[PDB]
């Protein structure tokens, strides 16, 4: 075996508790190098002559180059020291501990997980595990009150082609009027892009954090929305824009006016005074030269105090969580304290960070509960949309991503197909509905929480910002109702099958030539196998009956009954068809 | 190129800032696999049309299986995305990024270090880097006041054999009396084990955190000690026992008397009432069944404020830092807040955690400045004391350990040979002074902060606790004055050669056959090469002139001049001899 390929660390995503007395440990090795991985462990103060406890680590996954083994250690003392015993195909064995590798156990040393503090066990809101999120970009969802429309509003039509400065009149009253639709779809939570006072259509350049934007409504209307959504079983998630403010933010205007004499100058990153001349900003902003968005110095206790108050105010209005804008450019201390504040006010309030890359640094349990899973989007884009990768590469990317974070984070990642910052997924699929649907079926059955971008469910299309922000299509005749009913069925099944929301996930089959991919979701005695024929050709495949699942399966999408023949299942898939096989338990 | 052996993560010790605009990045590959490692980077919002910046990563080290490449990225924007370009021996070129490996750069993706916040740049007290610490176990150092001696105090003699419950009368007045001695040795800081009220001789079972133990003195005496040490250029570090209290601690006494009625019952981990009764404890304690040490629930905000108050009190007395007892069993939040409290009170107060294993989780910059480096001791024991490993594995263990933490931590790690919890190092060497001295020579020249265990400098020996806590030997005739003078010279040298305190470290030469180990310390134009002949036979060797060090060298220990012919130095080392070759700059 290739020892240079073996990896483990007593922290992060390779060692973490799932309870106050149980520790999950993972180990990585070159694919095929290790057939048996066992963990020998004991209390960190156990005597030299005490027997070590044993825990066998099953193979939890494999990507292109590695195998990932996982075990559960029962640590009643909450203190554990442990070593791995790795066995190869030829029976060659070796111990792997903190000191290194050795045939002699004592020489390998022991990894140590010092202490398991209850306060450090990653815990997330129970409801977030089985939620189906629907993203609403207010200015474009529904114009329920044209009397608050901004001047110059354009026509709310299917042929609308938004500009960076277009307005259509979307508002909160509209959202309220359309709740019956959202409820019928099966949505359980709504994520809103900024809704606080701001001059733009997107409103990421905040003028006033404590006020609902006039064109969207007022506090009484917001409160009504929260109540109407809640009694319909729908939660509310707001967009927290704490990385930067708008240039109309009071503190910033003060600096613009008083400059060096401003009591708020240290609330930002001003390069020199006066504050500006044009787009040539002499102050740090979001991205590059974005005059309307001066970066906030969240490291300043005054700024942190202010934003924390903003958070308190809105949570008082009854919201259920936050979506953190550009979360990765706000300091960690801020986020650790934010989590403490939020959870103290509402233990069930969800915290989702908006980060597009590897977000492990914010997903260990003391900061966010989840993140906008763009890694998931990329793999889904490449596999179902552009066809840039095949099923085996898809399986690998998913597996590698799953191993990036502790299971508590993975279980609730917001798996989106697109957002208000990307082209519509149907457009990514070049308008191919068959491909789009397969992606959706995957999104609705995979490990994580699905996030639906408004309109995708009724066939909307579009290029990237601002063309992805076109007015919602409400005209029944202009909506893809077949797709809508498709979504409804998938969402109902998700709520219907426990393994789909709370089950683990394991690869079942991945064939690069047939481009068929299958995985199994498991919890308790229930097993649900999802098979995706990601090819424009009808195919048949023989899959091994999933580990301890039973001999009778039912494709919940068709009512088709399939029996295990000599430990196998014969499946015939039409082009781009997906099956959701329930083992009946 | 074995891709399965290549590793990098955009955080931890593989990617971290050394300043507000500079990110240090490290990458490891199978030893020999990569000949050139380059980093191509840019601002995270740079246009796809902009050209990437270039940074060549030199080989910063190599262990038994890997090569470690290190580079410095200039990030004026404080936001960076990057990809590695690795070239094999044959000229093979592969790109490595967050997405994976590929001959095509774009397909490799890019790692991202979202933002560099000034508050997250690991910063340590400037003085700690060039310090030489002396550890004082007060009950056994010096009895300056015989009137405060504990009951049954035993004879202060060289033939003393301490028992777990012995007392010899050591106190703070004695330390004050021996300051001229400590100053002569050249020590710059004193690390004291517990000195607060406690009934034991070690005092890790705290009765009163706010009072000097009567056997050791009183507050005024402590203050005088602080002042007398300070005026002699000696700082003071106290032992903070925050993981557990003594069973005579006021809060615990209360729980013992009032039980479930006690307002302090949640300050501990009580399983049932009434509490205690012999060694069969019904409450969690340090280690296993240690009735005198009930664990403190530092997660409890009341417990945390009390301890923080304890820390504020002693810092008001003028101390310079803390040594955190069993730091790995106290929660991370407590430690993050502790650091902010401490640093706000005294920016130069040092925080050293007592952790015996990989302490990377506490050394990223938001918790401890350093730790008692027991990993260093293990390597030193195996190589110099037991001879269990040869020069090449020694070099490997050292390099591997060095790569475990960011450079800010490594530079000030407390490198000890032994402690009040281990057998004396001389005893580890089986009484061999030649091996002992070579280890000390290594300790005084290697990267990190040397920690001297009281008595080792004058030849004390002893088995592990309690035998390693023998009363100090003060009678000159019973002291190894030759050793003492050796220590003095090495300490002076360390203070005189900037590279020994502020320089980096790189392997120079390691040969298992001759068991010769050499490394070089470098800062600016100063290069100091250390050659250790760890064998009991006179030997001669040839070493390539230290990279860009120059051609004139001087062994500071003897005054011997070495010129080096054709880029090589000819060295003749006596048995267990060591050389400290200064390049003259
Ligand atoms: O010409 C300037 C610009 O102006 C307008 O943009 C404004 C926008 O309309 C408005 O809504 C707002 O934008 C906010 C946005 O809505 C929020 O969701 C958020 O979005 C920003 C992200 O938070 C931020 O991280 C970044 O995103 C970049 C990723 O970080 C980066 O990783 C990369 O993504 C790639 C991944 O790295 C890779 O792993 C994966 O495979 O591929 C990804 C790319 O496909 O690149 C991302 C894009 O830079 O920027 C996001 C903003 O776009 O915060 C925003 C700010 O509040 O304000 C905007 C500024 O005024 C126009 O609409 C826009 O077209 C125009 O470019
Ligand atoms: O039966 C009674 C008991 O009495 C004595 O113990 C008491 C001791 O005399 C007294 O001073 C005090 O002890 C404290 C000690 O002085 C402090 O420094 C500290 O020490 C404890 C450590 O903090 C704690 O982590 C642990 O140490 C363990 C290491 O974590 C663990 O890694 C492992 O160490 C190995 C290293 O990893 C490796 O690098 C090296 O090569 O080999 C090591 C050996 O395995 O094991 C360590 C031992 O478990 O315990 C330390 C305590 O010894 O905190 C202490 C508590 O405040 O109180 C003691 C209890 O009353 C005797 O000394 C003891 O033998 C006897 O059993
Ligand atoms: Ca309107
Ligand atoms: Ca005394």
UniProtKB/Swiss-Prot annotation, chains A, B:
<dbReference type="GO" id="GO:0046872">
    <property type="term" value="F:metal ion binding"/>
</dbReference>
<feature type="site" description="Transition state stabilizer">
    <location>
        <position position="421"/>
    </location>
</feature>
<feature type="binding site">
    <location>
        <position position="244"/>
    </location>
    <ligand>
        <name>substrate</name>
    </ligand>
</feature>
<dbReference type="InterPro" id="IPR017853">
    <property type="entry name" value="Glycoside_hydrolase_SF"/>
</dbReference>
<comment type="similarity">
    <text>Belongs to the glycosyl hydrolase 13 family.</text>
</comment>
<dbReference type="InterPro" id="IPR014756">
    <property type="entry name" value="Ig_E-set"/>
</dbReference>
<keyword id="KW-0106">Calcium</keyword>
<feature type="binding site">
    <location>
        <position position="169"/>
    </location>
    <ligand>
        <name>Ca(2+)</name>
    </ligand>
</feature>
<comment type="function">
    <text>Hydrolyzes pullulan efficiently but only a small amount of starch. Endohydrolysis of 1,4-alpha-glucosidic linkages in pullulan to form panose. Also cleaves (1-6)-alpha-glucosidic linkages to form maltotriose.</text>
</comment>
<dbReference type="Pfam" id="PF16657">
    <property type="entry name" value="Malt_amylase_C"/>
</dbReference>
<dbReference type="InterPro" id="IPR004185">
    <property type="entry name" value="Glyco_hydro_13_lg-like_dom"/>
</dbReference>
<dbReference type="GO" id="GO:0031216">
    <property type="term" value="F:neopullulanase activity"/>
</dbReference>
<dbReference type="Pfam" id="PF00128">
    <property type="entry name" value="Alpha-amylase"/>
</dbReference>
<comment type="subunit">
    <text>Monomer.</text>
</comment>
<feature type="binding site">
    <location>
        <begin position="420"/>
        <end position="421"/>
    </location>
    <ligand>
        <name>substrate</name>
    </ligand>
</feature>
<feature type="binding site">
    <location>
        <position position="171"/>
    </location>
    <ligand>
        <name>Ca(2+)</name>
    </ligand>
</feature>
<dbReference type="Pfam" id="PF02903">
    <property type="entry name" value="Alpha-amylase_N"/>
</dbReference>
<keyword id="KW-0119">Carbohydrate metabolism</keyword>
<dbReference type="InterPro" id="IPR032091">
    <property type="entry name" value="Malt_amylase-like_C"/>
</dbReference>
<feature type="active site" description="Nucleophile">
    <location>
        <position position="325"/>
    </location>
</feature>
<feature type="active site" description="Proton donor">
    <location>
        <position position="354"/>
    </location>
</feature>
<keyword id="KW-0326">Glycosidase</keyword>
<keyword id="KW-0479">Metal-binding</keyword>
<dbReference type="InterPro" id="IPR013783">
    <property type="entry name" value="Ig-like_fold"/>
</dbReference>
<keyword id="KW-0378">Hydrolase</keyword>
<dbReference type="InterPro" id="IPR013780">
    <property type="entry name" value="Glyco_hydro_b"/>
</dbReference>
<feature type="binding site">
    <location>
        <position position="323"/>
    </location>
    <ligand>
        <name>substrate</name>
    </ligand>
</feature>
<dbReference type="InterPro" id="IPR006047">
    <property type="entry name" value="Glyco_hydro_13_cat_dom"/>
</dbReference>
<feature type="binding site">
    <location>
        <position position="143"/>
    </location>
    <ligand>
        <name>Ca(2+)</name>
    </ligand>
</feature>
<feature type="binding site">
    <location>
        <position position="148"/>
    </location>
    <ligand>
        <name>Ca(2+)</name>
    </ligand>
</feature>
<feature type="binding site">
    <location>
        <position position="149"/>
    </location>
    <ligand>
        <name>Ca(2+)</name>
    </ligand>
</feature>
<protein>
    <recommendedName>
        <fullName>Neopullulanase 2</fullName>
        <ecNumber>3.2.1.135</ecNumber>
    </recommendedName>
</protein>
<feature type="binding site">
    <location>
        <position position="145"/>
    </location>
    <ligand>
        <name>Ca(2+)</name>
    </ligand>
</feature>
<feature type="binding site">
    <location>
        <position position="469"/>
    </location>
    <ligand>
        <name>substrate</name>
    </ligand>
</feature>
<dbReference type="GO" id="GO:0005975">
    <property type="term" value="P:carbohydrate metabolic process"/>
</dbReference>
<feature type="binding site">
    <location>
        <position position="465"/>
    </location>
    <ligand>
        <name>substrate</name>
    </ligand>
</feature>
<dbReference type="InterPro" id="IPR045857">
    <property type="entry name" value="O16G_dom_2"/>
</dbReference>
